[PDB]
């Protein structure tokens, strides 16, 4: 099955009908203000009325702002795209930071285009050069059309094609019983391979045997393909066709991220505007997520101003676990939360607070029921005392070894002696930090 993820127990925000945040919903307890604020944010995402909006999430480590940001995508669904990106990915050797952020802005937004396809496929029963009778003194023989037979399990059908395609059928190898791909709209003819029925005549043959297609001879089906503006920017960035020698050699070369000029962006915006005016393509906005925003360079902080002031900028969310810190790139400059005041004024700050011991016990119970672990009352109280003493995260991490050791000992439930032995063997971060002080001279 699916491997259990730390955030996999968060299925969404769990909002009510009136907009208020239920206390316990979708495995989330507490943080009513943050869940309601994000509850308005998802209404902005669904509304699509504004662009370039930047939200900020601040608070102590372990408050669940990442669980809320990831819960936003779960509440929105799979219709709108969601692009989490850490600030560490902004620094790259080949591609510049501004091109990284731009390509992320193109990664958020996406398109969906509906298209119909008509395809003829099957085994070839017969191929005839149908000859009409029109003898002329200028040219002796006349051929009106070529008949191509096709056989499938559901039915057989014959097709009357112009003789011009027989020049390609004679240009490439075509044998009786060859399963071929023929599209009516494109008009091109490709050879799939030999049918599996004739594979029994020879013990060894070079041609591979593809099975006969199961279905009607003429297949017309409508499929909607979703392609993001970033994919469009890459396909427009490098040619996919390898007919050219420079495209073949460049295809042999190692692919590297290239800086894309704004002209291609403008052309994409224009053709996208045209298809939107036609109504065939459906455009949906994306949701960009950013974690460890305090790790960005000051050049990225100033670039986010011109990036956010644009109307094509998708909604961006930020996550900052740090307080007042020195801005990276400048030694003597200090700013609250680790972000300059210019961007910090533009972003919408959301405050988060630490959980109470009761909420710690409830979250521990939720994680226990998620991982499928049973906890006794008293051991849950002592574990809540441990989490309150140090952190919620450590008390969450203490669940697995007590479950495994409990199964080894034969007890299907966790006991205070189990969490006591586990708490004795393993060391919390603060206790280890205090132990390092005495032996620091030997280190």
């Amino acid at each position: 099955t699916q491997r259990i993820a730390s955030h996999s127990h968060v299925k969404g925000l769990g909002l009510d009908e009136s907009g208020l945040a239920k206390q316990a919903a979708s495995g989330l307890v507490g943080q009513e203000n943050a869940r309601e604020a994000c509850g308005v944010i998802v209404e902005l995402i669904k509304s699509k009325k504004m662009a370039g909006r930047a939200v900020l999430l601040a608070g102590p480590p372990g408050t669940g702002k990442t669980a809320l940001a990831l819960a936003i995508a779960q509440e929105l669904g799979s219709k709108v795209p969601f692009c989490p990106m850490v600030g560490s990915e902004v620094y790259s050797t080949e591609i510049k930071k501004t091109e990284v952020l731009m390509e992320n802005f193109r990664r958020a937004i996406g398109l969906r285009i509906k298209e119909t396809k008509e395809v003829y496929e099957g085994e070839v029963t017969e191929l005839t050069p149908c000859e009409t009778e029109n003898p002329m003194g200028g040219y002796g023989k006349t051929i009106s059309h070529v008949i191509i037979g096709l056989k499938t399990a559901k039915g057989t059908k014959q097709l009357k094609l112009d003789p011009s395609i027989f020049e390609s059928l004679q240009k490439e190898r075509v044998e009786a019983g060859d399963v071929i791909y023929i599209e009516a709209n494109s008009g091109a003819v490709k050879r799939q391979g030999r049918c599996d029925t004739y594979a029994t005549e020879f013990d060894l043959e070079a041609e591979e045997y593809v099975p006969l297609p199961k279905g009607d001879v003429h297949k017309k089906k409508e499929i909607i393909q979703d392609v993001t503006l970033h994919d469009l920017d890459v396909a427009n960035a490098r040619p996919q066709g390898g007919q050219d020698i420079l495209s073949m050699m460049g295809q042999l070369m190692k692919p590297k991220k290239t800086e894309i000029t704004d002209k291609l962006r403008g052309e994409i915006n224009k053709v996208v505007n045209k298809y939107i005016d036609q109504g065939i393509a459906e455009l949906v906005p994306g949701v960009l997520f950013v974690d460890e925003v305090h790790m960005l360079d000051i050049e990225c902080f100033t670039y986010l101003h011109r990036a956010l002031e644009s109307s094509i900028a998708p909604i961006v969310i930020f996550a900052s676990n740090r307080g007042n810190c020195v801005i990276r790139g400048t030694e003597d400059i200090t700013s609250p939360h680790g972000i300059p005041l210019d961007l910090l004024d533009r972003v919408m700050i959301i405050r988060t607070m630490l959980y109470t011991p009761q909420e710690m016990k409830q979250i521990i119970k939720i994680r226990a029921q998620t991982e499928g672990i049973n906890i006794s009352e008293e051991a849950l109280n002592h574990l809540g005392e441990i989490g309150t003493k140090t952190t919620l995260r450590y008390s969450v991490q203490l669940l697995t070894p007590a479950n495994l050791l409990a199964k080894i000992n034969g007890k299907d439930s966790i006991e205070k002696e189990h969490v006591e032995e586990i708490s004795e063997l393993f060391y919390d971060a603060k206790s280890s930090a205090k132990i390092l002080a005495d032996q620091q001279d030997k280190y």
Binding site: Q2, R3, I4, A5, S6, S8, P61, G62, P84, V86, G87, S88, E89, Y91, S92, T93, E94, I95, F202, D203, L204, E205, A206, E207, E208, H230, D231, Q251, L252, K254, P255, K256, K257, D291, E292, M295, N321, V326, T391, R393, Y394, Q397, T400, P401, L404, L405, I408, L425, F426, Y427, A429, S432, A433, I435, L436, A437, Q439, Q440, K442, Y443
Partner: protein, 434 residues
């Protein structure tokens, strides 16, 4: 007398990690003595690795230098068993001029997740006795020989065109696949190729295949996740796989990889095997990497993390701060810390007795007191070098067993770092850049 590519090493004297049904570490097991809580927690997290029910977990080991962090790490790795994906990289290996550090750590997390698949195939591999063709549709047959049997194959026109295009001649050991249709030439026979006075630039000798000529069987192939990335990124993924030229991989292809592998897991065809990622000397690392490890742990899939820090408090490179284990406090709570204890002077004699069996050089009970005195007053590795360096002097003395005078002699030949510092203080004015 034959020497393999592997030779004796610091961590090479231990094979496997002894445990029990109650996870009680033995006093001496597979050449490992001490660290009861460390070995026990190593068995707990090791059984956790064997279960693999959860992902995105990080375990940091803490203790004084010389407590055997890499010893218990390699013991856990060997006790985990073979055919388990294991990647142990130094903190400086991720630094590359062609690749970004995010791509280095990313590929480090991707390569340690394996996938076991099952595929049935049929192959015909044997030595060609003869080749004959007739062109009027050309019809031809070839005679093949194996130790068990010899048989002929009648092949079609294009199947003849493949062998004639490859200039295949009689007397060559080849492999033919009927489903795919490709021909793989392994080489030529010894007796058949002996007739030629000289051999071409590219040639090889392969023995006559034994067993069934045409074998139809099911084989389980174990693949790694790092291989698929280059193959789906470039037309040729193996050239950049062995060349290491690929770099700066787009994340969209990785997402499509995770989606397709998730589809395979939904089909139940292939099952994923968890893996171990070990990082040593993590005290010096980039704060950008420390920020990336957050989402690396919060990802849906990720191998188990085992990291070692040899310093209690050290300033992180690139910024000025004082933090435990040279790591930030935000990532400090994501780690499961296992403390260790220094080795006792009584256990030193025991582990030295274990190290005597590695060199097969017997030592008298009176020598373990001096060698243990050196392994106590000074670093243990220095004494581990004192026994090996002393055996050579013993062979120079042509004695059957080492003596205390050997450890005194080698102790006079080699000096401790503290002593070299003491003389370096006297001669320090003569040395450059004192």
């Amino acid at each position: 007398d034959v020497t393999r590519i592997e030779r004796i090493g610091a961590h090479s004297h231990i094979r496997g990690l002894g445990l029990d049904d109650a996870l009680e570490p033995r006093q001496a097991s597979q050449g490992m003595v001490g660290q009861l809580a460390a070995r026990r927690a190593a068995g707990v997290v090791l059984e956790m690795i064997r279960e693999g029910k959860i992902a995105g977990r990080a375990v940091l080991i803490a203790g004084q230098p010389g407590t055997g962090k890499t010893a218990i790490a390699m013991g856990m790795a060997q006790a985990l068993g073979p055919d388990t994906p294991f990647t142990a990289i130094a903190g400086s290996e991720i630094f590359s001029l062609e690749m970004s550090k995010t791509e280095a750590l990313t590929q480090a997390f991707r390569r340690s997740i394996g996938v076991r698949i099952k595929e049935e195939t049929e192959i015909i591999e044997g030595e060609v006795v003869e080749i004959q063709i007739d062109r009027p549709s050309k019809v031809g047959k070839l005679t093949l020989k194996t130790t068990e049997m010899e048989t002929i194959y009648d092949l079609g026109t294009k199947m003849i065109e493949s062998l004639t295009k490859d200039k295949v001649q009689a007397g060559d050991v080849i492999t033919i696949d009927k489903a795919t249709g490709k021909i793989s030439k392994l080489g030529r026979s010894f007796t058949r190729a002996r007739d030629y006075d000289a051999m071409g630039s590219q040639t090889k000798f392969v023995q006559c295949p034994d067993g069934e000529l045409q074998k139809r069987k099911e084989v389980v192939h174990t693949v790694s996740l790092h291989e698929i990335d280059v193959i789906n990124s470039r037309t040729q993924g193996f050239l950049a796989l062995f060349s290491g030229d690929t770099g700066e991989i787009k994340s969209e292809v990785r997402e499509q990889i995770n989606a397709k592998v998730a589809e395979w897991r939904e089909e139940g065809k292939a099952e994923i095997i968890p893996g171990v990622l070990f990082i040593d000397e993590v005290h010096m690392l980039d704060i950008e990497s420390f920020s990336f490890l957050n989402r690396a742990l919060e990802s849906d899939m990720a191998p188990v993390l085992i990291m070692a820090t040899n310093r209690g408090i050290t300033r992180i490179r690139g910024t000025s701060y004082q933090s435990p284990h040279g790591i930030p406090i935000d990532l400090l709570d994501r780690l499961l810390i296992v403390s260790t204890t220094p080795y006792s002077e009584k256990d030193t004699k025991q582990i030295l007795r274990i190290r005597c069996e590695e060199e097969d050089v017997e030592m008298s009970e009176d020598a373990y007191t001096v060698l243990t005195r050196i392994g106590l007053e000074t670093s243990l590795r220095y004494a581990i070098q004192l026994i090996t360096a002393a055996s050579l002097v013993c062979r120079k003395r042509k004695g059957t067993e080492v003596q205390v005078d050997d450890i005194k002699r080698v102790y006079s030949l080699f000096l401790d770092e503290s002593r070299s510092t003491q003389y370096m203080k006297e001669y320090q004015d003569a040395f450059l850049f004192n």
